[PDB]
């Protein structure tokens, strides 16, 4: 069993960067891939990138190809994302889950609540 | 969804990386036998076809 | 090498290994070359002392 | 005559030809498997516990 702990609320100014970790339990860092959603309020939920720890490699959303910042730390088995010159249209809901390899099933966290 | 023994479904896998210590550690499986190898070492080595 | 193991001193070397080979074999079945897997060069092995 | 006839040394070509083929056939023997799953030692113990 795999559950995701997101952080807190924020809020922040125009111009600032945001950083929302995920860390992991159930162990299968390594072997599985962190993906990054975001869902701004009256949308849908928006891919924006995501990293695979064991392979070190990242992938971003076409919208996102600059001022998002996907990484991972396997000591602590948490992944990472960060999204910089931040305004107001920014704010969403942000989501880490998991889809190990091995399984079919998706884990999400509870979401992580980000305004400017 | 499964196929029937007399018709099996065979697969191939390549350009990938296997970290086979999940499915030896999940104790979800009833039958776990490796031939020819150790299970613990699926992830030391490198396979081909 | 691809999970072939053992202990000894790589230097290059100038076997042509054709397109389907990966390793070379000596006259004791010992690996006496190897092609390295990122860089596709032949590197030959021999004992370190 | 010893110049002209080749075989005329042969008494001491035999004790070099013979050794020779005494540690040819061990290296050879190497080769084996004598019942075991390879004839390499590091493939032995690289696969299994
Ligand atoms: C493997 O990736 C490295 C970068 O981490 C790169 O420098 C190297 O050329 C790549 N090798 C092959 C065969 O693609």
């Known amino acids: 069993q795999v559950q995701l702990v997101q952080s807190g609320a924020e809020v922040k100014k125009p111009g600032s960067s945001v950083k929302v970790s995920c860390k992991a339990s159930?162990?299968?860092?390594?072997?599985?891939?962190i993906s990054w959603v975001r869902q701004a309020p009256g949308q849908g939920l928006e891919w924006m990138g995501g990293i695979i720890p064991i392979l070190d490699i990242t992938n971003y959303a076409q919208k996102f190809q600059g001022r998002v910042t996907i990484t991972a730390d396997k000591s602590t088995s948490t992944a990472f994302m960060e999204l910089s010159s931040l305004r107001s249209e920014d704010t969403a809901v942000y989501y880490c889950?998991?889809?190990?390899?091995?399984?079919?099933?998706?884990?999400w966290g509870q979401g992580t609540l980000v305004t400017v | 969804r499964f196929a029937s023994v007399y018709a099996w479904n065979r697969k191939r896998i390549s350009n990938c990386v296997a970290d086979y210590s999940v499915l030896y550690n999940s104790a979800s499986f009833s039958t776990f036998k490796c031939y020819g190898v150790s299970p613990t070492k699926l992830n030391d080595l490198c396979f081909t076809n | 090498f691809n999970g072939l193991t053992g202990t000894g001193v790589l230097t290059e070397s100038n076997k042509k290994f054709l397109p389907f080979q990966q390793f070379g074999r000596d006259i004791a079945d010992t690996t006496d070359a190897v092609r390295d897997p990122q860089t596709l060069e032949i590197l030959d092995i021999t004992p370190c002392s | 005559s010893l110049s002209s006839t080749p075989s005329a040394l042969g008494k001491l070509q035999d004790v070099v030809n013979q050794n020779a083929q005494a540690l040819n056939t061990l290296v050879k023997q190497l080769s084996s498997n004598f019942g075991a799953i390879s004839s390499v030692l590091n493939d032995i113990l690289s696969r299994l516990d």
């Open positions: 159930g162990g299968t860092f390594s072997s599985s891939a």
């Open positions: 889950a998991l889809r190990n390899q091995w399984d079919l099933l998706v884990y």
